[PDB]
């Protein structure tokens, strides 16, 4: 409603770096808000795509950003009569970035790994890896919980059980307020998907460079299954956290599985021990229900609510025809211990192939009316197909069915404007939470400042 679409701020990265593929707000030890931006196709030392991370200071003019440096060299360690190998080419460092306290966690979901033992091997596979950095101090750390040293033959004997070789950990990520990093690995367990959790402080204290394979005893991974409903379900494509069990000491996990049960798609709410509390089933196959999840209390009752995006939903139209537009689902948490019912509200896109619901960002309370609000992206929507971001204001009964404001892409066609979103942070310190929008196709990020209501 009260975002300013006239005077924007533009940050930019190298050409073809996909700068803006992921973004988050970052507060240093003094509370000064910056913007961390992931560019998964940034050139490395060997002139090859490795990815990169940029830490943009807040400036009303924007412009270029300094790099948040990480080690991009491939590593090899000959230990225990084995050969451990890391491969960082096309690893996509910056495909997901997230900030907690004065720490930034940037992940390379496609970093490959292999273990050589004589003529055998573990198979060169994308286990993924996340890089951690405390910018002010310069401390660095890595976390790659799916790296193994088991040879290929053993997985065949056990029918590919507990096979974490293709995790792509860091595909999605989130950090609990207690400081526990939760990584989504949608390829874990032979593309069933798994979640990896570990305290941030323990990742730093247990990490030493060159070890490659080390124990993080305080970590906790999800479990394999034999249920064909989870096969090729990509559990962990999207992740989020919230409070859904009434206990404020525990933190609950929200996980997206957009191809669950033969591309029906699902979203599951779990406790910290990965025991399922709820499961939201998709409405239509191949709609990619669960591509994105968002947690915020929209109706002002203190209870976290859930939003699920299905960007490929095909709406029913006249003459028995379907039109792919995308759809967002709103679930209100009921009072006390009860199961989340049917959706309280359905928001459906309008532009064909717009992918409405590709990203859902909680804005906090934008217009300062007491109810939190959200922003939904349609990166190929709008009358021109250049991309749109729509703002939906919360109300006592949930959300408004019509948008209060529509943001048209200021970038050329194909920029994927809105593919990544982030709000609920006042970056210019004017008392109103703002919105940062990524457009990796144009290698830029646009900052929308919230102003007093007119």
């Amino acid at each position, epitope marked *: 409603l009260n975002l300013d679409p006239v005077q924007l701020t533009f940050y930019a990265g190298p050409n073809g770096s996909q700068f803006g593929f992921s973004l988050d707000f970052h507060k240093d030890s003094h509370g000064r808000v910056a913007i961390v931006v992931g560019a998964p196709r940034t050139l490395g030392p060997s002139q090859e795509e490795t990815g990169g991370v940029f830490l943009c200071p807040w400036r009303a003019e924007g412009g270029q950003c300094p790099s948040l440096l990480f080690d991009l060299r491939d590593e090899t360690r*000959n*230990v*225990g009569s084995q050969t451990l190998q890391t491969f960082k080419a096309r690893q996509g460092l910056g495909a997901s970035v997230v900030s907690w306290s004065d720490v930034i966690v940037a992940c390379a979901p496609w970093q490959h790994w292999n273990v050589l033992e004589k003529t055998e091997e573990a198979e060169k596979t994308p286990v993924g890896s996340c890089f951690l950095a405390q910018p002010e101090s310069g401390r660095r750390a890595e976390y790659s919980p799916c790296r193994g*040293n088991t040879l290929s033959r053993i997985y065949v004997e056990n029918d590919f059980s507990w096979d974490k070789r293709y995790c792509e950990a860091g595909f999605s990520s989130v950090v609990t307020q207690a400081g526990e990093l939760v990584l989504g690995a949608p390829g874990g367990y032979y593309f069933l998907g798994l979640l990896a959790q570990a305290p941030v402080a323990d990742i730093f204290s247990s990490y030493r460079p*060159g*070890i490659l394979l080390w*124990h993080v005893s305080s970590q906790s991974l999800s479990f394999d299954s034999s249920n064909p409903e989870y096969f090729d379900g990509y559990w962990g494509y999207s992740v989020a956290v919230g409070e859904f069990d009434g206990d404020l000491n525990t933190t609950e996990y929200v996980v997206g599985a957009p191809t669950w049960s033969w591309t029906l798609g699902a979203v599951e709410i779990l406790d910290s021990y990965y025991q399922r509390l709820h499961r939201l089933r998709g409405e239509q196959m191949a709609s990619y229900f669960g591509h994105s999840v968002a947690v915020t209390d929209v109706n002002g009752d203190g209870r976290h609510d859930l939003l699920v995006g299905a960007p490929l939903y095909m709406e029913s139209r006249a003459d028995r025809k379907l039109a792919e537009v995308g759809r967002v689902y709103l679930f209100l948490q009921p009072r006390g211990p009860h199961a989340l019912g049917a959706p309280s509200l359905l928001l459906t896109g309008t532009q064909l192939y717009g992918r409405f619901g590709s990203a859902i960002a909680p804005l906090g309370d934008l217009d300062r009316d007491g109810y939190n609000d959200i922003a939904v992206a349609a990166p190929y929507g709008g009358p021109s197909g250049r991309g749109q971001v729509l703002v939906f204001l919360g109300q006592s009964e949930g959300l408004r069915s019509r948008p209060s404001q529509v943001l048209d892409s200021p970038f050329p066609t194909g920029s994927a404007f809105g593919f990544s979103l982030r709000g609920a942070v006042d970056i210019d310190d004017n008392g109103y939470p703002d919105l940062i929008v990524g457009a990796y196709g144009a290698n830029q990020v646009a900052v929308y400042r919230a102003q007093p209501v007119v």
Partner: antibody, heavy 119, light 108 residues
Framework: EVQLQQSGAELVKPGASVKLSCTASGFNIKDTYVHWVKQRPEQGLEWIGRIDPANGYTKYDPKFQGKATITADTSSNTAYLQLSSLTSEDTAVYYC????????????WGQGTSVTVSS | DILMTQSPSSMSVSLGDTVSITCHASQGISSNIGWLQQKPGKSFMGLIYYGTNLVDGVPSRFSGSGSGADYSLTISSLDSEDFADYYCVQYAQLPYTFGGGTKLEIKR
């Protein structure tokens, strides 16, 4: 805290067999590798072998192939070392070892089990 | 197997001295080495792993260094509890092999 508690000292006769224990305290034995090391005053320290209690796979120094047999039971959270066809040269102190962070390291040690072979 | 030649076999030193124990390998092991301590009549304590990393709880006066097939353990300002045995161990290849052992004795 990580503490490795081993069985008491053993006094046995040559040609017999003995089975030492190594119980995990403060953690799960299934987490890391578990090694076995032999110590003698003259011959010094020797690496017997290792085991991954999560699956039972083992590795051995070929010098001990036959006498030493390393096993583990995750139920009792314990790892075992069995020595057969005992000799006066087997009289030694035996430790079980596990690493701290590095998968292949040798950092945490038990108090050591004394073994005396004599007729 | 990989031979681990530790030196010296023993040394007589005083408190506050800065001493260095060396450990040579029959081949390159690329920092895949650990150092151990055995106080008189007691069990083993881990000091260093992967050449330079201190085990949690070990004082900062201990310090490891080296590369290839030559490494060292240095104790700056010896303490009364440091008078004990010290062993090096490689784990680059299986089987793991230890050094001969170094004993720190009080000079008088």
């Amino acid at each position: 805290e990580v503490q490795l508690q081993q069985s008491g000292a053993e006094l046995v006769k040559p040609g017999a067999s003995v089975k030492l224990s190594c119980t995990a305290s403060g953690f799960n034995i299934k987490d890391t590798y578990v090694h076995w090391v032999k110590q003698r005053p003259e011959q010094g320290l020797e690496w017997i072998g290792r085991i991954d209690p999560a699956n039972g796979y083992t590795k051995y120094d070929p010098k001990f192939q036959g006498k030493a047999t390393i096993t583990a039971d995750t139920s009792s959270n314990t790892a075992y070392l069995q020595l057969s066809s005992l000799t006066s040269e087997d009289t030694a102190v035996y430790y079980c070892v596990r690493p701290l962070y590095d998968y292949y390291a040798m950092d945490y040690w038990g108090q050591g089990t004394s073994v005396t072979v004599s007729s | 197997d990989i031979l681990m030649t530790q030196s010296p076999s023993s040394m007589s030193v005083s408190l506050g001295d800065t001493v260095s124990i060396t450990c040579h390998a029959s081949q390159g092991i690329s920092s895949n080495i650990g150092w151990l301590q055995q106080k008189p009549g007691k069990s083993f304590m881990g000091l260093i792993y992967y050449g330079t990393n201190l085990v949690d709880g070990v004082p900062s006066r201990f310090s490891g260094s080296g590369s290839g097939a030559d490494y060292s353990l240095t104790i700056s300002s010896l303490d009364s509890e440091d008078f004990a045995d010290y062993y090096c161990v490689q784990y680059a290849q299986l089987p793991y092999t230890f050094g001969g052992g170094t004993k720190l004795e009080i000079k008088r």
